[PDB]
Design a protein around this nucleic acid. Structure first.
Ligand code: ZN
Ligand code: ZN
Lengths: 197, 197
DNA sequence: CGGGCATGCCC
DNA sequence: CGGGCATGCCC
Protein backbone atom coordinates (compact mmCIF):
# COMPACT_ATOMS: atom_id res chain seq x y z
CA UNK A 1 0.00 0.00 0.00
CA UNK A 2 1.08 3.55 -0.63
CA UNK A 3 2.96 5.45 2.10
CA UNK A 4 1.95 8.88 0.45
CA UNK A 5 -1.11 10.15 2.30
CA UNK A 6 -3.89 11.58 0.36
CA UNK A 7 -3.88 15.30 -0.22
CA UNK A 8 -7.23 15.61 -2.09
CA UNK A 9 -9.68 18.14 -0.65
CA UNK A 10 -12.68 16.37 0.94
CA UNK A 11 -14.94 18.99 2.58
CA UNK A 12 -17.30 16.04 3.41
CA UNK A 13 -20.71 15.92 5.16
CA UNK A 14 -19.73 18.37 7.86
CA UNK A 15 -18.79 21.10 5.27
CA UNK A 16 -15.24 21.38 6.61
CA UNK A 17 -13.15 24.35 5.34
CA UNK A 18 -10.11 26.17 6.69
CA UNK A 19 -9.88 29.95 7.25
CA UNK A 20 -6.93 32.26 7.88
CA UNK A 21 -6.56 35.71 9.48
CA UNK A 22 -5.92 38.76 7.43
CA UNK A 23 -2.55 40.26 8.08
CA UNK A 24 -0.82 43.66 7.77
CA UNK A 25 1.21 44.86 4.77
CA UNK A 26 4.75 44.55 6.40
CA UNK A 27 7.61 43.05 4.46
CA UNK A 28 8.34 40.75 7.41
CA UNK A 29 4.79 40.21 8.77
CA UNK A 30 4.96 37.04 10.93
CA UNK A 31 2.13 35.16 9.19
CA UNK A 32 0.16 35.98 6.04
CA UNK A 33 -2.15 33.93 3.78
CA UNK A 34 -2.56 34.16 -0.03
CA UNK A 35 -6.07 33.02 -1.16
CA UNK A 36 -5.03 33.16 -4.78
CA UNK A 37 -2.24 30.65 -4.16
CA UNK A 38 -3.92 28.79 -1.21
CA UNK A 39 -0.57 29.36 0.56
CA UNK A 40 0.51 30.51 4.02
CA UNK A 41 3.73 32.51 4.25
CA UNK A 42 5.12 32.59 7.74
CA UNK A 43 8.23 32.87 9.93
CA UNK A 44 9.80 29.91 11.68
CA UNK A 45 8.75 28.99 15.22
CA UNK A 46 6.10 31.76 15.20
CA UNK A 47 2.38 31.42 15.71
CA UNK A 48 0.30 30.50 12.62
CA UNK A 49 -3.41 30.55 13.48
CA UNK A 50 -5.60 28.25 11.33
CA UNK A 51 -9.35 28.34 11.65
CA UNK A 52 -11.57 25.30 11.32
CA UNK A 53 -14.98 26.04 9.81
CA UNK A 54 -17.81 23.43 9.72
CA UNK A 55 -21.48 23.64 8.69
CA UNK A 56 -22.53 20.69 10.92
CA UNK A 57 -21.25 19.76 14.39
CA UNK A 58 -18.75 16.85 14.39
CA UNK A 59 -19.41 13.97 16.79
CA UNK A 60 -17.89 13.90 20.29
CA UNK A 61 -14.34 12.69 20.24
CA UNK A 62 -13.47 14.15 16.82
CA UNK A 63 -9.72 14.80 16.32
CA UNK A 64 -7.80 17.37 14.15
CA UNK A 65 -4.58 16.08 12.61
CA UNK A 66 -1.97 18.15 10.78
CA UNK A 67 0.76 16.54 8.63
CA UNK A 68 3.28 18.09 6.17
CA UNK A 69 4.01 16.50 2.79
CA UNK A 70 6.27 17.71 0.03
CA UNK A 71 4.09 19.29 -2.61
CA UNK A 72 6.20 18.33 -5.70
CA UNK A 73 6.48 14.78 -7.14
CA UNK A 74 10.29 14.97 -6.75
CA UNK A 75 9.98 14.67 -2.91
CA UNK A 76 6.33 13.65 -2.29
CA UNK A 77 7.43 10.15 -1.14
CA UNK A 78 9.97 11.56 1.40
CA UNK A 79 9.00 12.31 5.00
CA UNK A 80 9.05 15.98 5.92
CA UNK A 81 11.23 16.43 8.98
CA UNK A 82 12.93 19.19 10.88
CA UNK A 83 16.53 19.85 9.67
CA UNK A 84 19.49 18.60 11.82
CA UNK A 85 20.34 22.12 12.96
CA UNK A 86 16.86 23.02 14.29
CA UNK A 87 16.54 19.48 15.72
CA UNK A 88 19.75 20.11 17.73
CA UNK A 89 18.90 23.59 18.78
CA UNK A 90 15.49 22.27 20.10
CA UNK A 91 8.75 20.63 25.41
CA UNK A 92 6.44 17.82 24.21
CA UNK A 93 7.18 18.02 20.49
CA UNK A 94 9.89 15.51 19.42
CA UNK A 95 12.80 17.47 18.05
CA UNK A 96 12.55 15.85 14.56
CA UNK A 97 8.94 17.12 14.10
CA UNK A 98 8.49 20.14 11.87
CA UNK A 99 4.97 21.12 13.05
CA UNK A 100 4.22 21.96 16.75
CA UNK A 101 0.92 23.09 18.28
CA UNK A 102 0.71 25.82 20.95
CA UNK A 103 -2.12 26.59 23.31
CA UNK A 104 -3.59 23.11 23.79
CA UNK A 105 -3.50 20.71 26.71
CA UNK A 106 -4.07 17.49 24.76
CA UNK A 107 -1.62 17.58 21.83
CA UNK A 108 -0.33 14.16 20.65
CA UNK A 109 2.72 13.85 18.43
CA UNK A 110 2.66 10.74 16.28
CA UNK A 111 5.38 8.91 14.28
CA UNK A 112 3.61 6.42 12.01
CA UNK A 113 5.08 2.96 12.53
CA UNK A 114 4.67 2.01 8.88
CA UNK A 115 5.13 5.20 6.93
CA UNK A 116 7.45 7.06 9.38
CA UNK A 117 5.43 10.24 8.74
CA UNK A 118 5.03 12.70 11.59
CA UNK A 119 1.72 14.28 12.52
CA UNK A 120 0.34 16.26 15.45
CA UNK A 121 -3.24 15.83 16.63
CA UNK A 122 -5.55 17.81 18.97
CA UNK A 123 -9.20 17.24 19.98
CA UNK A 124 -11.78 19.00 17.83
CA UNK A 125 -13.61 21.59 20.00
CA UNK A 126 -16.69 23.37 18.60
CA UNK A 127 -16.52 27.18 18.42
CA UNK A 128 -17.18 29.11 21.55
CA UNK A 129 -20.87 29.85 21.67
CA UNK A 130 -20.75 32.99 19.52
CA UNK A 131 -17.73 32.33 17.25
CA UNK A 132 -18.23 30.67 13.88
CA UNK A 133 -14.85 28.81 13.90
CA UNK A 134 -12.27 27.08 16.10
CA UNK A 135 -8.64 28.29 15.90
CA UNK A 136 -5.58 26.07 16.37
CA UNK A 137 -2.16 27.62 16.66
CA UNK A 138 0.59 25.88 14.70
CA UNK A 139 4.28 26.53 14.45
CA UNK A 140 6.73 25.39 11.78
CA UNK A 141 10.17 24.87 13.21
CA UNK A 142 12.32 25.31 10.05
CA UNK A 143 12.37 27.72 7.17
CA UNK A 144 11.34 26.16 3.83
CA UNK A 145 14.96 26.78 2.80
CA UNK A 146 16.65 24.83 5.68
CA UNK A 147 19.44 22.75 4.29
CA UNK A 148 19.22 19.11 5.34
CA UNK A 149 15.39 19.54 5.81
CA UNK A 150 12.92 21.16 3.47
CA UNK A 151 15.90 22.55 1.48
CA UNK A 152 13.68 25.07 -0.50
CA UNK A 153 11.02 22.36 -1.41
CA UNK A 154 7.42 23.54 -0.89
CA UNK A 155 5.21 21.67 1.52
CA UNK A 156 1.52 21.24 1.97
CA UNK A 157 0.03 21.06 5.43
CA UNK A 158 -2.87 18.55 5.36
CA UNK A 159 -5.46 19.07 8.06
CA UNK A 160 -7.86 16.14 8.57
CA UNK A 161 -10.95 15.99 10.73
CA UNK A 162 -11.24 12.36 11.92
CA UNK A 163 -13.74 10.79 14.25
CA UNK A 164 -12.56 8.76 17.23
CA UNK A 165 -13.10 5.49 15.29
CA UNK A 166 -10.69 6.75 12.57
CA UNK A 167 -13.18 7.70 9.89
CA UNK A 168 -12.05 10.58 7.70
CA UNK A 169 -14.77 13.21 8.12
CA UNK A 170 -13.02 16.02 6.17
CA UNK A 171 -9.67 16.94 4.64
CA UNK A 172 -8.24 20.29 3.51
CA UNK A 173 -4.71 21.43 2.74
CA UNK A 174 -2.69 24.61 2.17
CA UNK A 175 0.77 25.20 0.88
CA UNK A 176 3.37 26.67 3.26
CA UNK A 177 6.45 28.78 2.74
CA UNK A 178 8.31 29.34 5.96
CA UNK A 179 10.59 32.34 5.37
CA UNK A 180 12.23 35.39 6.82
CA UNK A 181 10.01 37.93 4.98
CA UNK A 182 6.44 36.51 4.48
CA UNK A 183 5.08 39.80 3.09
CA UNK A 184 7.86 40.22 0.51
CA UNK A 185 7.63 36.63 -0.51
CA UNK A 186 3.80 36.42 -0.78
CA UNK A 187 3.82 39.55 -2.98
CA UNK A 188 6.61 38.13 -5.14
CA UNK A 189 4.75 34.89 -5.69
CA UNK A 190 1.40 36.55 -6.41
CA UNK A 191 3.15 38.83 -8.94
CA UNK A 192 4.90 35.81 -10.56
CA UNK A 193 1.50 34.11 -10.82
CA UNK A 194 0.08 37.11 -12.69
CA UNK A 195 3.04 37.56 -15.01
CA UNK A 196 4.14 33.96 -15.78
CA UNK A 197 1.53 31.61 -14.38
CA UNK B 1 44.99 30.51 30.55
CA UNK B 2 43.52 31.49 27.23
CA UNK B 3 41.70 28.87 25.13
CA UNK B 4 42.24 31.04 21.89
CA UNK B 5 45.31 29.67 20.12
CA UNK B 6 47.76 32.04 18.74
CA UNK B 7 47.34 33.10 15.16
CA UNK B 8 50.48 35.31 14.83
CA UNK B 9 52.78 34.46 11.92
CA UNK B 10 56.07 32.94 13.19
CA UNK B 11 58.19 31.89 10.19
CA UNK B 12 60.88 30.91 12.79
CA UNK B 13 64.42 29.50 12.38
CA UNK B 14 63.44 27.06 9.67
CA UNK B 15 62.03 29.88 7.41
CA UNK B 16 58.60 28.25 7.25
CA UNK B 17 56.13 29.69 4.67
CA UNK B 18 53.06 28.30 2.94
CA UNK B 19 52.50 28.22 -0.84
CA UNK B 20 49.42 27.61 -2.96
CA UNK B 21 48.85 26.45 -6.56
CA UNK B 22 47.74 28.81 -9.23
CA UNK B 23 44.31 28.04 -10.52
CA UNK B 24 42.24 28.63 -13.68
CA UNK B 25 39.86 31.54 -14.27
CA UNK B 26 36.52 29.55 -13.90
CA UNK B 27 33.66 30.99 -11.90
CA UNK B 28 33.41 27.71 -9.98
CA UNK B 29 37.10 26.64 -9.94
CA UNK B 30 37.42 24.08 -7.10
CA UNK B 31 40.26 25.82 -5.24
CA UNK B 32 41.87 29.23 -5.78
CA UNK B 33 44.17 31.41 -3.63
CA UNK B 34 44.22 35.24 -3.37
CA UNK B 35 47.72 36.55 -2.38
CA UNK B 36 46.37 40.04 -1.93
CA UNK B 37 43.90 38.83 0.70
CA UNK B 38 46.00 35.84 1.98
CA UNK B 39 42.77 33.85 1.45
CA UNK B 40 41.88 30.48 -0.07
CA UNK B 41 38.50 30.20 -1.80
CA UNK B 42 37.41 26.63 -2.25
CA UNK B 43 34.50 24.21 -2.56
CA UNK B 44 33.36 21.94 0.25
CA UNK B 45 34.79 18.43 0.57
CA UNK B 46 37.15 19.07 -2.39
CA UNK B 47 40.92 18.88 -2.43
CA UNK B 48 42.81 22.01 -1.27
CA UNK B 49 46.56 21.53 -1.76
CA UNK B 50 48.77 23.56 0.63
CA UNK B 51 52.51 23.62 0.18
CA UNK B 52 54.97 23.76 3.04
CA UNK B 53 58.16 25.68 2.23
CA UNK B 54 61.21 25.70 4.57
CA UNK B 55 64.74 27.09 4.20
CA UNK B 56 66.25 24.61 6.71
CA UNK B 57 65.37 20.94 7.26
CA UNK B 58 63.17 20.33 10.34
CA UNK B 59 64.31 17.64 12.79
CA UNK B 60 63.10 14.03 12.51
CA UNK B 61 59.69 13.59 14.01
CA UNK B 62 58.41 17.07 13.12
CA UNK B 63 54.58 17.28 12.86
CA UNK B 64 52.24 19.57 10.79
CA UNK B 65 49.04 20.61 12.55
CA UNK B 66 46.10 22.43 10.98
CA UNK B 67 43.36 24.09 13.09
CA UNK B 68 40.51 26.47 12.12
CA UNK B 69 39.65 29.53 14.22
CA UNK B 70 37.07 32.19 13.60
CA UNK B 71 38.85 35.21 12.22
CA UNK B 72 36.59 37.93 13.77
CA UNK B 73 36.53 38.86 17.50
CA UNK B 74 32.77 38.13 17.58
CA UNK B 75 33.43 34.34 17.32
CA UNK B 76 37.20 33.94 17.93
CA UNK B 77 36.55 32.24 21.32
CA UNK B 78 34.10 29.68 19.79
CA UNK B 79 35.30 26.31 18.47
CA UNK B 80 34.97 25.88 14.73
CA UNK B 81 33.03 22.71 14.04
CA UNK B 82 31.23 21.03 11.20
CA UNK B 83 27.50 21.96 11.01
CA UNK B 84 24.87 19.39 12.20
CA UNK B 85 23.77 18.64 8.64
CA UNK B 86 27.26 17.78 7.27
CA UNK B 87 28.03 15.95 10.54
CA UNK B 88 24.96 13.73 9.91
CA UNK B 89 25.55 13.23 6.26
CA UNK B 90 29.17 12.08 7.09
CA UNK B 91 36.46 7.28 7.41
CA UNK B 92 38.93 8.33 10.15
CA UNK B 93 37.85 11.95 10.53
CA UNK B 94 35.32 12.41 13.39
CA UNK B 95 32.13 13.74 11.88
CA UNK B 96 32.25 17.00 13.95
CA UNK B 97 35.66 17.97 12.46
CA UNK B 98 35.62 20.61 9.74
CA UNK B 99 39.12 19.91 8.32
CA UNK B 100 40.10 16.44 6.91
CA UNK B 101 43.39 15.40 5.31
CA UNK B 102 43.56 13.14 2.23
CA UNK B 103 46.49 11.18 0.90
CA UNK B 104 48.33 10.40 4.14
CA UNK B 105 48.71 7.19 6.12
CA UNK B 106 49.43 8.76 9.51
CA UNK B 107 46.74 11.42 10.04
CA UNK B 108 45.69 12.01 13.68
CA UNK B 109 42.51 13.87 14.56
CA UNK B 110 42.69 15.60 17.92
CA UNK B 111 40.00 17.06 20.23
CA UNK B 112 41.80 19.15 22.85
CA UNK B 113 40.72 18.05 26.32
CA UNK B 114 40.92 21.56 27.72
CA UNK B 115 39.98 23.86 24.89
CA UNK B 116 37.72 21.46 22.91
CA UNK B 117 39.35 22.70 19.69
CA UNK B 118 39.76 20.25 16.83
CA UNK B 119 42.96 19.86 14.86
CA UNK B 120 44.39 17.35 12.39
CA UNK B 121 48.08 16.48 12.35
CA UNK B 122 50.38 14.65 9.88
CA UNK B 123 54.13 13.93 9.99
CA UNK B 124 56.34 16.54 8.33
CA UNK B 125 58.08 14.91 5.33
CA UNK B 126 60.85 16.83 3.50
CA UNK B 127 60.31 17.48 -0.22
CA UNK B 128 61.03 14.71 -2.61
CA UNK B 129 64.63 15.04 -3.67
CA UNK B 130 64.03 17.57 -6.46
CA UNK B 131 60.90 19.42 -5.25
CA UNK B 132 61.27 22.58 -3.18
CA UNK B 133 58.10 21.99 -1.06
CA UNK B 134 55.90 19.35 0.56
CA UNK B 135 52.17 19.34 -0.30
CA UNK B 136 49.38 18.30 2.08
CA UNK B 137 45.87 17.89 0.80
CA UNK B 138 43.14 19.33 3.02
CA UNK B 139 39.40 19.30 2.73
CA UNK B 140 36.86 21.55 4.43
CA UNK B 141 33.62 19.74 5.04
CA UNK B 142 31.17 22.71 5.22
CA UNK B 143 30.65 25.86 3.24
CA UNK B 144 31.54 29.05 5.17
CA UNK B 145 27.80 29.79 4.99
CA UNK B 146 26.56 26.54 6.66
CA UNK B 147 23.88 27.37 9.15
CA UNK B 148 24.54 25.88 12.57
CA UNK B 149 28.33 25.84 11.77
CA UNK B 150 30.42 28.60 10.28
CA UNK B 151 27.17 30.45 9.43
CA UNK B 152 28.96 32.96 7.04
CA UNK B 153 31.78 33.76 9.62
CA UNK B 154 35.29 33.74 8.07
CA UNK B 155 37.86 31.34 9.40
CA UNK B 156 41.60 31.19 9.45
CA UNK B 157 43.38 27.89 9.02
CA UNK B 158 46.49 27.92 11.26
CA UNK B 159 49.25 25.57 10.16
CA UNK B 160 51.94 24.92 12.77
CA UNK B 161 55.21 23.07 12.36
CA UNK B 162 55.95 21.44 15.75
CA UNK B 163 58.78 19.19 16.77
CA UNK B 164 58.06 15.86 18.46
CA UNK B 165 58.74 17.40 21.91
CA UNK B 166 56.01 20.02 21.24
CA UNK B 167 58.15 23.03 20.47
CA UNK B 168 56.57 25.46 18.03
CA UNK B 169 59.05 25.65 15.14
CA UNK B 170 56.88 27.77 12.79
CA UNK B 171 53.34 29.08 12.37
CA UNK B 172 51.49 30.49 9.34
CA UNK B 173 47.83 31.06 8.62
CA UNK B 174 45.46 31.85 5.74
CA UNK B 175 41.87 32.85 5.62
CA UNK B 176 39.35 30.44 4.06
CA UNK B 177 36.04 30.94 2.32
CA UNK B 178 34.41 27.66 1.48
CA UNK B 179 31.81 28.41 -1.21
CA UNK B 180 30.01 27.22 -4.28
CA UNK B 181 31.82 29.58 -6.73
CA UNK B 182 35.46 30.23 -5.56
CA UNK B 183 36.36 32.17 -8.72
CA UNK B 184 33.36 34.50 -8.54
CA UNK B 185 33.84 35.05 -4.88
CA UNK B 186 37.64 35.66 -4.96
CA UNK B 187 37.13 38.24 -7.74
CA UNK B 188 34.32 39.92 -5.80
CA UNK B 189 36.43 40.22 -2.68
CA UNK B 190 39.53 41.47 -4.51
CA UNK B 191 37.36 44.10 -6.26
CA UNK B 192 35.78 45.13 -2.91
CA UNK B 193 39.30 45.49 -1.48
CA UNK B 194 40.25 47.86 -4.30
CA UNK B 195 37.08 49.93 -4.18
CA UNK B 196 36.28 50.11 -0.42
CA UNK B 197 39.20 48.68 1.49
C1' DC C 1 30.56 27.00 -18.39
C1' DG C 2 28.95 31.88 -16.93
C1' DG C 3 24.38 34.64 -16.20
C1' DG C 4 21.25 35.47 -12.98
C1' DC C 5 17.64 34.03 -9.36
C1' DA C 6 17.33 33.05 -4.01
C1' DT C 7 16.43 34.47 0.51
C1' DG C 8 18.33 34.89 5.27
C1' DC C 9 20.62 38.67 6.89
C1' DC C 10 23.00 43.42 7.02
C1' DC C 11 25.61 44.96 12.10
C1' DC D 1 10.52 49.22 9.04
C1' DG D 2 11.78 48.58 3.89
C1' DG D 3 16.10 48.66 0.68
C1' DG D 4 19.39 45.89 -0.86
C1' DC D 5 23.42 42.48 -0.25
C1' DA D 6 24.27 37.11 -0.04
C1' DT D 7 25.41 32.91 -2.15
C1' DG D 8 23.88 28.09 -3.07
C1' DC D 9 21.38 26.77 -6.82
C1' DC D 10 18.58 27.03 -11.33
C1' DC D 11 16.27 21.97 -13.33
ZN1 ZN E 1 15.76 24.05 10.02
ZN1 ZN F 1 27.89 22.24 6.75
Amino acid sequence: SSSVPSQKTYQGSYGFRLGFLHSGTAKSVTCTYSPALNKMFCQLAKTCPVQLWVDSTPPPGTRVRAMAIYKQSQRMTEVVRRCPHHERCSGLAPPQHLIRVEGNLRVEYLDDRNTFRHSVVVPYEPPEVGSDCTTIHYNYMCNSSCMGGMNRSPILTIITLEDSSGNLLGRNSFEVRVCACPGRDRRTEEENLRKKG
